[PDB]
Amino acid sequence: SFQVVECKTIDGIIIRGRFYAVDGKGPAIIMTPGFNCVKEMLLPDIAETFQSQGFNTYIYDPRSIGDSDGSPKNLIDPLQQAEDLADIVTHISSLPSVDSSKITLWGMSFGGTVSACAAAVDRRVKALVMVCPILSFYQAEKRDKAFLQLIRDRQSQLRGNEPFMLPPFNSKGENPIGMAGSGGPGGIEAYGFMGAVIDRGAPNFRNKIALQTYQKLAWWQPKEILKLVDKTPVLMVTPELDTMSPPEEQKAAFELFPQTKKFLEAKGKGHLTVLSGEGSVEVVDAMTEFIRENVAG
Amino acid sequence: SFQVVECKTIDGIIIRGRFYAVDGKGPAIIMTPGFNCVKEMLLPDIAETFQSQGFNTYIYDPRSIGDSDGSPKNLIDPLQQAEDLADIVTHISSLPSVDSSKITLWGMSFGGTVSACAAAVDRRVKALVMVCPILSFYQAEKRDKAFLQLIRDRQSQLRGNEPFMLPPFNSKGENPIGMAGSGGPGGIEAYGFMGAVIDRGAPNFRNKIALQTYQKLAWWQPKEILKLVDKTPVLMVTPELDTMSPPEEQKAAFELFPQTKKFLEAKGKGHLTVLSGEGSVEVVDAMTEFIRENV
Ligand SMILES: [Cl-]
Ligand SMILES: [Cl-]
Ligand code: NA
Numbered sequence: 001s002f003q004v005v006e007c008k009t010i011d012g013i014i015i016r017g018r019f020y021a022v023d024g025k026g027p028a029i030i031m032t033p034g035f036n037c038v039k040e041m042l043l044p045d046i047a048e049t050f051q052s053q054g055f056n057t058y059i060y061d062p063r064s065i066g067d068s069d070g071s072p073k074n075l076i077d078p079l080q081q082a083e084d085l086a087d088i089v090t091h092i093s094s095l096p097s098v099d100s101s102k103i104t105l106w107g108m109s110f111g112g113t114v115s116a117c118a119a120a121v122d123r124r125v126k127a128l129v130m131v132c133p134i135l136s137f138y139q140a141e142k143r144d145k146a147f148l149q150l151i152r153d154r155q156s157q158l159r160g161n162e163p164f165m166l167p168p169f170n171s172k173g174e175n176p177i178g179m180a181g182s183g184g185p186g187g188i189e190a191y192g193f194m195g196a197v198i199d200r201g202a203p204n205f206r207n208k209i210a211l212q213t214y215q216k217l218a219w220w221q222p223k224e225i226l227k228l229v230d231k232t233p234v235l236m237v238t239p240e241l242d243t244m245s246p247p248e249e250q251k252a253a254f255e256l257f258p259q260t261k262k263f264l265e266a267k268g269k270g271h272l273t274v275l276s277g278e279g280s281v282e283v284v285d286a287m288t289e290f291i292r293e294n295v296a297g
Numbered sequence: 298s299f300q301v302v303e304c305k306t307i308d309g310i311i312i313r314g315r316f317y318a319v320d321g322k323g324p325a326i327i328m329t330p331g332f333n334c335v336k337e338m339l340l341p342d343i344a345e346t347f348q349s350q351g352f353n354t355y356i357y358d359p360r361s362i363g364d365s366d367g368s369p370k371n372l373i374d375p376l377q378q379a380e381d382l383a384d385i386v387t388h389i390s391s392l393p394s395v396d397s398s399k400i401t402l403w404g405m406s407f408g409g410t411v412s413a414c415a416a417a418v419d420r421r422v423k424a425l426v427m428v429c430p431i432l433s434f435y436q437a438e439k440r441d442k443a444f445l446q447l448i449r450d451r452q453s454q455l456r457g458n459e460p461f462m463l464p465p466f467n468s469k470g471e472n473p474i475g476m477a478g479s480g481g482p483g484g485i486e487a488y489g490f491m492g493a494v495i496d497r498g499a500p501n502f503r504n505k506i507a508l509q510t511y512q513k514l515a516w517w518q519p520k521e522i523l524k525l526v527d528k529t530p531v532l533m534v535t536p537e538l539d540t541m542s543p544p545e546e547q548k549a550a551f552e553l554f555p556q557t558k559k560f561l562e563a564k565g566k567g568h569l570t571v572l573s574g575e576g577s578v579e580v581v582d583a584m585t586e587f588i589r590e591n592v
Binding site: 008010079082083086087090117120121122123124143144147148150151154155157158215218219220221224225228 | 307387417418441445447516521
C-alpha cells in the first residue's frame with residue numbers, strides 16, 4: 001500500500017507522489033518517471049517489489065505534470081526537475097520510516113538522465129540507477145526550423161497567447177526536434193504508448209507538452225553533467241533493442257564512469273519493455289541487489 | 298541623448314534599459330553587461346559612440362539586476378538571460394527607429410557568453426560581438442564543497458530563510474566555486490573593481506549575488522552551446538593579459554566557429570580594461586566596422 005506524500009520546492013511548488021512505506025526505518029528509493037510520464041505508468045509494479053524487499057519507495061509526478069504543481073503545464077525542464085529532486089530528497093529524508101543515510105535515486109528513460117544530474121550535486125544520493133537513459137534530443141537537420149518555431153512561440157506569447165502545446169509524438173511518430181526515435185520505429189511506438197494511456201490510473205495524464213520544452217532541451221548538455229558523477233555508485237540498465245535511445249550512446253556514457261558501477265543489458269527489450277515481460281523479475285532483483293551492496297549506511 | 302525603454306518577457310518580468318536612438322530607421326545593437334553588472338558601468342560611453350555612428354543602441358540591466366524586475370535579486374541565471382534576450386530582441390525590433398533586419402547582439406565578459414547563447418537559437422541576430430567572454434566557472438577542487446553549500450542553502454530556504462547572498466569576489470579575490478580569477482591576481486582585481494563601482498557613479502549596483510547563481514553555473518555548458526552558433530558572423534575581442542578568462546580558452550572557442558568570423562586581441566589589456574585607455578577607440582571602431590561589413 002501507499003500514501004500520498006507531497007514535497008515543497010524552494011519556489012513554493014508542491015510535488016505530489018505515492019510513498020510506499022516500510023515498517024521501522026529503512027532505505028528509500030526515489031523514482032523519477034520518463035518524458036511527460038505520470039507516476040502511475042509502469043512504476044507502481046516496481047515500487048511494490050521495492051517495498052516488499054524493504055525499500056521505502058517514492059514515485060512522483062515531476063513539476064507541471066500529472067498531480068503536481070507547476071506552470072506552464074507539461075513544460076519539461078530537465079534542469080528544474082534535477083533541482084526539484086534535491087528538495088524531494090530533503091522531504092523524503094525527513095519521513096519517520098526513512099533512513100536519511102540510505103537514499104537512492106532511480107530514473108527511467110528521460111528520468112534516469114534527470115536523476116544523474118541531481119546525483120551530480122547532492123552527496124545525500126548514495127546510489128544512482130538509470131534505466132534506458134536518453135542522452136541526446138536534436139537531429140541536426142531539424143535544429144534551425146525548431147529554433148525558429150520556438151522564437152515564434154515566444155513572439156505569440158508576448159502578444160498575449162498561451163504557450164503552444166503539441167503531442168510529444170504525432171501519428172507519424174515524429175516531433176519538431178527529432179527526439180526519442182522520431183522518424184523511426186521508436187517514435188511510432190512512443191506515439192502508441194502515449195496515446196494508449198487511454199485507460200484509468202491517472203486523471204491528470206495529459207498527452208501534450210509545451211513547445212518551450214524544446215528550448216530547455218536545447219540548453220541541456222547531460223553528457224557533460226554525467227561527467228560530474230564521479231563518486232556515486234551507478235547501475236545502468238540498457239535495452240538491447242532500444243529504438244528511442246541508442247544503446248551505444250548509453251554505453252558510451254557508462255564507460256566514462258570511474259567509480260563503482262554495473263551495466264545490465266536487457267536482451268531483446270526496447271525502451272518501453274525493458275522492465276516488462278520475461279527477464280523483468282531478474283532485472284528488478286538486480287537493482288535491489290546493487291542498492292543493497294552499495295547503500296549500506 | 299537616450300530614453301528609458303522597457304521590454305517585457307514571456308513570464309511577465311520587466312527588463313529596463315537605456316535606448317540610444319538614431320534618426321530615421323537604422324540598425325540596432327543590444328548590449329548585455331558582465332556578471333552582476335549594471336548598464337551604467339562603462340557601456341554608456343560605448344553606446345554614445347555606436348549612436349553617433351548610426352546604431353540604435355540598447356543597454357539594459359538583466360533580470361533581477363539593477364533597475365530590472367526579477368526575484369530573487371541578483372540571481373545570475375545565464376540561460377534565462379539568453380532567453381530574455383529573445384524577448385528583448387522582439388521589443389527592440391518593434392521600435393520605430395529600428396530596422397528589424399539588422400539586429401546585433403553585443404556582450405562584455407559573462408554577457409558576451411550569454412549573447413552567444415541567444416544568437417544560437419535566434420536567426421534575427423545577424424551579428425554577434427563577444428568581448429572577453431568567460432567560458433568556464435568551476436575549479437574542480439572546489440566543486441564538492443560548493444555543491445554541498447548549495448544544497449544547504451536550499452534547505453535553509455525550505456525552512457523559510459532568504460536565499461544566501463555573498464559578494465562575487467571576497468577581499469582575497471575568491472569565491473566558493475573558483476570563478477573568474479579566484480585565487481589569483483584576476484580575482485583580486487575583480488574584488489577591487491566591484492568594490493569601487495558605487496563610488497565610480499553607478500547607483501543601482503548591489504555588490505552581492507544569490508549563492509544559487511552557482512547552481513545555474515554548474516548546469517551551464519556554454520562551450521557546447523557556442524558550437525550551435527555556426528552561422529552568425531562573430532567578432533571576438535580578447536584582452537592579451539586577461540587574468541579572469543584565460544585568453545587561450547577564448548581562442549579555443551573562436552577556433553571552432555565555422556562561419557564568417559574575426560578575432561581581435563587587445564595588446565596589454567586585461568579583462569576589465571580591454572575597452573579602456575589606449576587603443577580603445579580603434580577597438581570600438583573595429584566593432585562597428587565588423588557589424589556594417591556583415592549586417
Ligand atoms: Cl516506521
Ligand atoms: Cl534518519
Ligand atoms: Na532545420
